[PDB]
Design a protein around this ligand. Sequence first.
Ligand SMILES: CC(C)c1cnn2c(NCc3ccccc3)cc(NC[C@H]3CCNC[C@@H]3O)nc12
Length: 275
Amino acid sequence: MENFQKVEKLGEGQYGVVYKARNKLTGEVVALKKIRSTAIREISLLKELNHPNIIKLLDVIHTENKLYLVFEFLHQDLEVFMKASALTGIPLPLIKSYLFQLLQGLAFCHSHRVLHRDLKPNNLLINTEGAIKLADFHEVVTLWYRAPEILLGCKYYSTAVDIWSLGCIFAEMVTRRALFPGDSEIDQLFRIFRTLGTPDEVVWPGVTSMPDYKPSFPKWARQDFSKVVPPLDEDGRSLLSQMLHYDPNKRISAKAALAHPFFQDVTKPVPHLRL
Ligand SMILES: CC(C)c1cnn2c(NCc3ccccc3)cc(NC[C@H]3CCNC[C@@H]3O)nc12
């Protein structure tokens, strides 16, 4: 830490605390994550995962029990920007741009057999140029973006978990309200079931044999989908429904979603950021 002037705590990541910091020699402003053997080798592969829509990992330093990860610093997160934009909403062309960019990032991750696993507005980072990046591959766990197969005890996540999370974020950008704001795993699951219908073997083969599936779950009927994201046009609703299929095998892939008609008129607008 003698090599960095700390400036400000930014918050808690998945495995430790993040500081904005300045490199003493270069003047570079970076985000430094402080963590607390096979992870040393695995995070080194994460340094080679370079794409415009993925946060740049600049350095991995292992020393005195702790691991420091030095990342690119970005000026705001999407959670903050959505709160700042809640009176009027984020304009639809900017929603569309951010969704398209995140799908490019995920298509890249997934083609390199990297999953995110915990996508949420606060690990999506934005800049003044209109880019958005995937990041963070006594705090209370947020379950609102959790795919149903995770909540039902699937041991082997697939890439589809990230498409589900991104679908929940898409919905929240458009409606200005979180799609499934549960405060426990069972409340999260029942919020999903009340909106999308309690899944059965017709819509999700194998659902009843999942570790945490109980025959005794309530049987709610699927809500009408025009009721769930009203301001979204039918192309947006179609895409969303494909991102929120219960069966991960049915759920659209990032690569397939990029070809969806919702993106025919996609553009790259400038956000209004107050920094
Ligand atoms: C560690 C790396 C991924 C990183 C780069 N920029 N940046 C910003 N920037 C936005 C910002 C700027 C100024 C004040 C607050 C937030 C915030 C931030 N927050 C810390 C956690 C919060 C929970 N989600 C994961 C984040 O890395 N982590 C990062």
